[PDB]
Subunit: 400 residues, 5 copies
C-alpha cells in the first residue's frame, strides 16, 4: 500500500546500520535477553556435547524507527531483514559447532515506537562437562553462556529474564528438573572494561529404566547362574566349561559397556566398579573349582590326609551342615592262590574307601565355598548398587 | 524480445521487496499453503528424526505485479529470483537440521493478473515422537508444523489445500496410511487476532516381514533347540554345554536387538519383553539340568531316598507318564575265601541296584521337566507375540 | 587487449539477466540437454541412494550476444560468470542431497553467433529403487530426471542428445551395461502445451567374485563340515559339541550379510533364503544327533526294542546299505559259590549282548541319516543358487 | 599511505575483471602451473579416494597492473582479493568432493612489472583407482589432473614446473616414492588447437610393519597351533574341541580382515587367497581327526582289519616312521565252573588284543597326517607370502 | 546518536580497505599476535588431528582512524564488520579442515587513538604427529603455526605475546603441561627480509586411570588365570579347553586395541608388544599341556621309559620340588585254572605299576612347567610395563 511504501521509504533515509541507536551516546543501551527451551535433542557423553533446540529472545528500544500512526493509519508494525538495522551481537561462548554461530537469522519486528523484537531459532551444540561417577543414576548440569562479543558494560547493558519452558517437549531418556539463569560481570586480559553475560544452567536427570533392564539384570542373572558351578557333581566334568563360558559371556558384556563410556580418567564409574566385582568373583569361583577338582581326583597310596585338614573338613563342617560322612600239594597251592586273590580284593577295597573319603572332603569344600560365594555376591552387589545417591528416588520414580 | 524487456524494466520501478503487496494495509493478505509428499527417505529410531522429500506449495496475490496483456503481446508470465520480490516467510517450526531452513530457493512464477506461485523443494528433517512400545508392529504419527515466523493474522492468514500424494514412490519398509491436515487459529493475550497455521501428520505402518523373518524366527528356533537338553541321556556327559552355548548364542541376538533399539525409558518394548522371557526360560532349563545331574551321579552309600521322593517320583509321575521301572582245614579255608568273594559280589549288586534307582529318578525328572518347559515356552511366546494390537492385520498384509 | 574490452563493455549495455533471450517472446527457446558419465562411486543399498560423477551439457542461442568478428579483430569467444547472463534452470528432480542443487557453477562460453555452452560438473546423489530380490546376482536400473523447474513448453523445449560415455572410469564392483533415455512431453488439463523433459536410466550389474568367494563358499564349507557329526563314533563323547559349535559359528557369520541387507519387506532375498536353508539343515542335524545318542546309551534292563523298529533297522536297512551284523558239605558250599559267580557272569554277558544290539541300531540310524542329510543339503544348495536368472552369465563373466 | 592510496585508485580505473589481460587478443596467455605437496591425509581403500594437502602455484603477466616505482617510492607490490582482478579457472577434473573446488581463495600478489602470483591452499580429495591385488605389499599410483575449465589453447596455454616437495611431512604408513609430471596437448575435431594440461601421478608405497605384526603373525601362529590335534592321545576325549575352536577363532579373524578390504571383483587379494588356504588346512585337519577317532574307537567285534590296511599301516609306515608295534560228582561241576571263567577271561583277552591293532593303526595314521600337514602348511604359506613382488624390499626396509 | 552518526560518516570517507594503514608506505606495520586456549576438545589418533577451542588476539594500529574526542562528546569506540576496514590475513598453516579458515568473522574494535583489536573465535582442527610408541603412558607435542599469507617483513613485522590459559577448562582425558611460543624469522634468496611467524606448541599428557583399568588389569588377570591348567588333574578331561578358551577370550583385546590403535608402522606400541608377549605365553602353555597329556595317557606295553627321563624326572625334579612318588587229574585241572587267573592278575598289576609311573612323571613335569611359566609371565609383565619413561610419574599422579 501507499502508506507502507512511504513509511519504508522514509525510515531508511539517512540510516546507518553500524551505529548504536541511542538518544544520548553516553548512556548505555538496555537489552533484555531471555530464552525459550524446546527440546533436548541429544546428550553425548563421549564428546561431552549437549545438543539443544532453543529460541533466543532479545528485545531492545531503537530510537530512530519511531513514527506517528496518524500519518500511516494502516501500518502498525514493520519488519526488517538481516543486514538493514543494528542488531546486538549476542552469541554463545562455549559453542562446539564447526561454525561458531548457529542461529538462523530472521526478520526483526518493530513497534510503532521503536521497541524491536528478535526471535531467532537454531540448534545449538554447546560443550558441557559430563559426570559419570554415578552412572546411570547421575544428574547432569550443563551451562549456556551468552554475552555480547564486542560491546562493553558501558555500551550495551545486558539484562536477564526468566527462561520459558512452556512449549517444552518431554524426552524419553532425560527428564528436565529446571533451568535457572544468572548474570555476572567478568574481566579479560584483552581490555579494562567489564563484559556482562547471561548463563543458563540446565539441570536434568537420566531415566534409568532402559539401563536397569538391559545392563544390570542380565549380568546379575549370569553371575547367579555362574554360582551353580558349586552344585555339579565332580563326575560330570563340566564345571570348568561352565565357568569359562560364563567368563566369556561377561567379557562380551564388558566390551558392550565399554563401547559407550568415555575415557574420562577422573572418577571410577559405579557400573565399572560393579562389573569389576563380578569379574573377580567369577575368577575366584574358577580357582576354587580347580582346587575342588584336584581334591576329588586324588590318587590313593600317594599321600595321606593331613590331620588338621581331616579333622576340620570331615568333622567340624560335617556337623555344621549336618551332612553325614558316607560309610595234596595241589590243594595247598589252590589255597594259597585263593588267599592271594582275596588279599588283592581287600587291598582294592581299602583303596576305594580312601578315595571315597577324599571325594567326601571335596564335596564338603564345595558346599562351604558355595555358601561363602553366594553371601559375598549378594552383599557386594547390594552395597555397590545402594552406594549411589538418589538411587531410591530414581528407582521409585522410574518403576512405580 | 523487446516487449518482455520493457515489461521487466517497468515492473521494478518504485518496487520495495520489504512491503506487503496489499491495497489497503488493513486487510490481511491471504496465502494458500499446501504440500506435496514424494518419498520417505529415513525414519531414525535412535535420533527420533524423520527425513522426507517434500515440495512446498505457496500461492498469494501481488497488487503491484499486474499488467495489461493487450499492450505486451506474447508475454504471459514473469519469473523473479530470490530477493527481488516479497515472499512469505513460512518455515518448519520443528526442524532437526543445523540450518533451520532446508529449502531450495527457486523462482516465483507470476501471472498477468498478479497471482504468485512458489514451489520450493527440499529434504526436510523433523523431530517427532516415535513410539516403540509395539516394536516391530508399529504405527507412527509424525507431525509437520508450518507457519509464518513474523507476520501475524492482521496481515497474513494461512489457508490450507489438501496435501497431494501423486508422485509418492512407495518405500520398501514403511507403508503409508494417510496424511491429513488441520488449519487452526491461536490467539494471544495482547490482540484479538488469529495466528493461523497448517499442520500435517504423516501416519506410517512398519512392514514386519524383514524383522519377523530375521529376528523372531531364529530366536524361537534356538529357544526350541534349547529344550533338547532334556532328551540327552546323562551318560553322554555333554548336557551343560548345550545349555550354555544356546544361552551365549541368544545373548548375541540380544546385543544386536539392543543396538537397533532406541534408549527410551517410558515403556518396555515387545522385543525386549520376549527376549527377557526367553532368557529366563533358558536359565531355568540350566538350573533344572544341574538338579538332574546331581540326582544321577549320586553316591549309593551315604545317602537315603526321602519318603517324599520315593512316594512321588517312582509311583505317581511314572504312572502319569507311562514309564516302566527296570527293577581238611584247607577245604574250610578255601570255602571262606570263596564265600568272601561271593559276599563282595552281593554288596556290589546291591550298590548298583541303588544307583539304577537313582538314575531312573533322574530320567523321570527329565521327562517331566521337558513337558512342563515345552508348554510354558509355547504359552509365553504366543502371549507375547499376540498381545500387540494390529498384529493380525500386520501378518495378513505382510506374510500373504 | 582493447578490442575485447570494448566488446565486453558493449555487450552488457541494456541487458537484463532475467528475460528469456528470444527474438519473438512468443516462440519457445530450443535448449539441448545431454550428459557425460565419468564415474560411479557409490551405490548404497541401505538408504537406496546412488552417487555419481557427471558433467551436464546445455546449449542454446542468445539473441543479444552477437557481434561481427571482423569488427573486433582477434576476439572469437566471450565467457560470462554466474549471475551475469540468463541461464536455463535445469535441476535434477529426484535428489537425495541436503542442497537440492549439488552443481558447481562455471562460466558460459559464447560464440560470435550467439551460441552458448554450459558444462557444469558436480557430484549427484540420487534416490532410486534398489531391488534386492536376487542379491548378489543383481542388475539394477536407476533413473535420473532433469527438467526446467519453472519454464514450461511454450517458452523452453528440451531436445535430448545421446549420453556420452567415453571418459567413463570402470568401477571395481559394478559394470556398465548402458545409459539410454527418452524425451517425454507431459500434458496438463490447463491448456495444450507440452512440458518436455529428459530422463536417463543407468543399468548396472553387480560383479559377484567378491561375494561368491567371501559368503557363498565359506558357508557351504561350514555346512558340509557339519555333516561330519555323522561319522563320529558315539564313544567319542564330543558329537553334540561339534554340531552346536557349527551352529553358533555360522549364526555369528550371518551378521556380515545382515549389516549389508536393507530392511525391505517387498521380497525375501536369495541369500537370506539360502542361509535359512542352512539353519534348517544344522538344526535337524543336531536333533538327529540327540536321537542317536539316546539310542546309544540305552539301559539294557528297562526296555525292549519293538518288533517294527527291529525289522526296519537290523535287517531291512542293514541290507539296503550292505553292513553286516556284528556277531563233604564244604564241597557243596563251594559248588554253590562258584555257580553263583558263573551265573552272575552269564547275566553280565546277556546284558552286554543287548547293549551291543542297541549300539548297532544307533550306528545304522546314524549312517542312514548321514546319507539323507548329505543328499538334502546338496540338492537344496544347488537349487537355490541356480534358481536366479543370469546366473550362468554371472559365473561366465566374473570367474572365468 | 598517500602514494599507495593513489596507486590503488589508479589501478582500478576502467578495469574489467572479465577480460584476459593480454596485449593483442590473438596470442594466448602463458600460465605457469606447479604444486606443493605437504602431507597425505588419508588413503581410503573402501571408497577409493585420496585426500591430500597441497598448495597450488600459478603465475602470469598483466598488461594493466603496471606502474613506475619512481613515482610511488614506497610501493612495490599490491594485493587484490577474489573478484577484483582476472584469475585463471583451473580445477581438478577428478574430485570426489561435494564442492567440486576445495581451494581457499586468498589474495593475488602483483609486482611492479605486472607479474602476478597466486597460492591458494586447500585439502583436495580425488578419486583414483587403488589396486589391492598385492595387499599389504602394495604400490599405488594416484593421478591428479589440473586444467582450465573454459579457456582453450589459443587463449591460455599452460606450462609445467616440476612439483616441489620440501615441507612435506612424512606419513606414518605411506612412503612417498615420487611425484612426476608432464604437459600434454589435445585436439578436437574442430581445428588444430592444442589443449595443454598438467597432471601429477603421486606414487606411494605402504609400510607393512603394522600389518605384518598384527595379521600375518597371529594367523600363522593359530594355524600352527591347529597342528597340535595330532599329538593329543585319543583317550583325552577333547581332540575335536581344539580343532573347532581354532576354526571359530580364525573365522572371526577373517571377518576382522575383510571388514576393511574393498569389495572389488577384478582380482583375488593376496590376504584373501592366504586365509582361504588356512581355512582349507584346518578343515582337512578336522576331517582327518574324525577319521582317526573312527579308527581308534573301533568295536572289536564288527569285522576284521583288511590285509591291505595291515600292510600299508602296521607293516610299511610303522617301519618308515620308526615306531615299535606292541604285540566226586560235584568235582565235574567245579571243573565246568572254572572252565567257563577261564574261557570268559581268554575271550576278553582276545578281544583286547584285537582292539590294540586298531589303536596302533590310529596312532600311525595320526603321525603320518601330522608330518604331511606340517610340511604342507609351511610350503603353502611361504609360497603365498613370497610370491608377491617387491616383498624382499618391503621386508628389508620395514624390518632392517 | 548524532555524534556517532557524524563520526561514522566521517571515518569512511575516501577509505580504501585494500591499503595498509601506514603513514610512510615504506615501513612495516607492527602486528601483535597472541592466542587464548579454552578447551582441548578432541585428540584423534587414527586420523592424527587435534581439535581445540581457541581465540586469537590480533592487534595493530590504524593511521587513518583517528578522531578528537572533544569534537565528538561521548563516542570513544567504533566497531566495523568484515570487509569494511583493513584486516591482516593470518591463517593456520597446518589446518586439517575442509575449510582452510574456521574462524568466525566478528567485529573490529577501534579506540580514539586508532588502535584496533580483533579476537575472532573458532574451532580449529590442526594436524600433528601422534607418537604412540609409549601407549598409554604418553606425552605429545602438537604444534600450531600462524603467519601472514601475503605480507612480508617490509610491510608487516609480526611480534608475539605469551599465550593465555587463564580460561582453560580441564579435559578428563589429557593433562595440559604447557604451551610455549617462539617468534622466528626466515630469509629468502631474493632479498634480505624477515618473515616473522609465531609457533605455539601444545604439550599434553594422557591420564591412564581409564586404560590402566580397562586394558591392563583384565589382560593380566586373564593371563594369570591361564596358568590354572597346571593345577588341574589330568583325569578331569577339561585340561586344554581352559587354555583354548582363554586364547579365544584373549583375541578380543587384540581386536579392541586394533580398533583404537592407529595404523602407523614406525614403531611397535607398548601395549601391542605386551599383548603379543601374553599370547606367546598362553600358546606355549597349551603346547606344554599337550605334552603332559601325551605323557599321562601312555600305553604301558608301548616302550621302556627312557633312562635319561628317569634320572631327570624321578631323580632330581622330585627332590627339587619335594614330592614323593606313590609306591585226581580234575584237581590238577583246577590248579591250572586258578594258576591262569592268578597270572592274569599279576600281569594286570605290572601294567598298573607302569601306568602309575608314567602318571607321576606327567605330574612332576606339570609342576615344573607351572613354576617356570609363572616366573616367566611375571617377569615379562613387569619388564614390559616398567620399560617406559614417566611410568612412576603416571602412577603416582593418577592412581594416588
Ligand atoms: C617482479 O616479479 C617477477 C617475478 O617473476 C620478476 O620476474 C623475474 O625476476 C627475476 C629477477 O631478475 C628474473 O631473473 C626473471 O627472469 C624474471 N622472470 C621472467 C619471466 O622474466 C620481475 O623481474 C619483478 N619485477 C620487478 C620490478 O621487481
Ligand atoms: C548525556 O548524558 C550526560 C550525563 O548525564 C550529559 O552530561 C549529557 O548532557 C547528555 N547529552 C545531552 C545532549 O544532553
Amino acid at each position: 500500500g501507499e502508506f507502507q511504501r512511504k513509511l519504508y521509504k522514509e525510515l531508511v533515509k539517512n540510516y546507518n546500520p553500524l551505529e548504536r541507536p541511542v538518544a544520548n551516546d553516553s548512556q548505555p543501551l538496555t537489552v533484555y535477553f531471555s530464552l525459550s527451551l524446546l527440546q533436548i535433542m541429544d546428550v553425548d557423553e563421549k564428546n561431552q556435547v549437549l545438543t539443544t533446540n532453543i529460541w533466543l529472545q532479545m528485545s531492545w528500544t531503537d530510537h530512530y524507527l519511531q513514527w506517528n500512526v496518524s500519518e500511516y493509519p494502516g501500518v502498525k508494525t514493520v519488519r526488517f531483514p538481516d543486514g538493514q538495522i543494528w542488531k546486538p551481537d549476542i552469541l554463545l561462548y562455549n559453542s562446539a559447532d564447526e561454525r561458531f554461530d548457529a542461529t538462523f537469522h530472521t526478520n526483526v519486528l518493530v513497534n510503532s515506537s521503536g521497541h524491536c523484537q528478535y526471535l531467532p531459532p537454531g540448534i545449538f551444540k554447546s560443550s558441557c562437562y559430563i559426570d559419570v561417577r554415578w552412572f546411570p543414576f547421575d544428574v547432569q548440569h550443563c551451562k549456556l553462556k551468552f554475552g555480547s562479543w564486542s560491546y562493553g558494560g558501558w555500551s550495551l547493558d545486558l539484562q536477564m529474564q526468566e527462561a520459558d519452558i512452556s512449549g517444552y517437549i518431554p524426552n524419553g531418556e532425560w527428564d528436565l528438573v529446571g533451568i535457572p539463569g544468572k548474570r555476572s560481570e567478568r574481566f579479560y586480559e584483552c581490555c579494562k572494561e567489564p563484559y556482562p553475560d547471561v548463563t543458563f544452567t540446565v539441570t536434568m536427570r537420566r531415566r534409568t529404566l532402559y539401563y536397569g533392564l538391559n545392563l544390570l539384570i542380565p549380568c546379575v542373572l549370569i553371575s547367579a547362574l555362574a554360582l551353580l558351578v558349586f552344585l555339579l557333581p565332580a563326575d560330570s566334568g563340566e564345571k570348568i566349561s561352565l565357568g569359562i563360558t560364563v567368563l566369556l559371556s561377561l567379557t562380551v558384556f564388558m566390551l558392550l559397556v565399554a563401547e559407550i563410556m568415555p575415557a574420562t580418567s577422573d572418577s571410577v564409574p559405579l557400573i565399572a566398579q560393579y562389573f569389576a566385582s563380578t569379574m573377580i568373583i567369577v575368577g575366584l569361583s574358577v580357582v576354587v573349582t580347580v582346587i575342588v577338582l584336584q581334591y576329588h581326583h586324588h590318587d590313593p597310596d600317594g599321600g595321606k590326609m593331613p590331620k588338621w585338614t581331616r579333622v576340620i573338613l570331615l568333622n567340624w563342617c560335617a556337623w555344621f551342615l549336618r551332612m553325614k560322612r558316607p560309610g595234596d600239594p595241589d590243594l595247598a597251592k589252590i589255597l594259597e592262590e585263593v588267599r592271594y586273590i582275596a588279599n588283592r580284593f581287600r587291598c582294592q577295597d581299602e583303596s576305594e574307601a580312601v578315595c571315597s573319603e577324599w571325594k567326601f572332603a571335596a564335596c564338603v569344600v564345595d558346599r562351604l565355598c558355595l555358601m561363602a560365594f553366594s553371601v559375598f555376591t549378594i552383599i557386594c552387589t547390594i552395597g555397590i548398587l545402594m552406594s549411589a545417591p538418589n538411587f531410591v528416588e530414581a528407582v521409585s520414580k522410574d518403576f512405580a
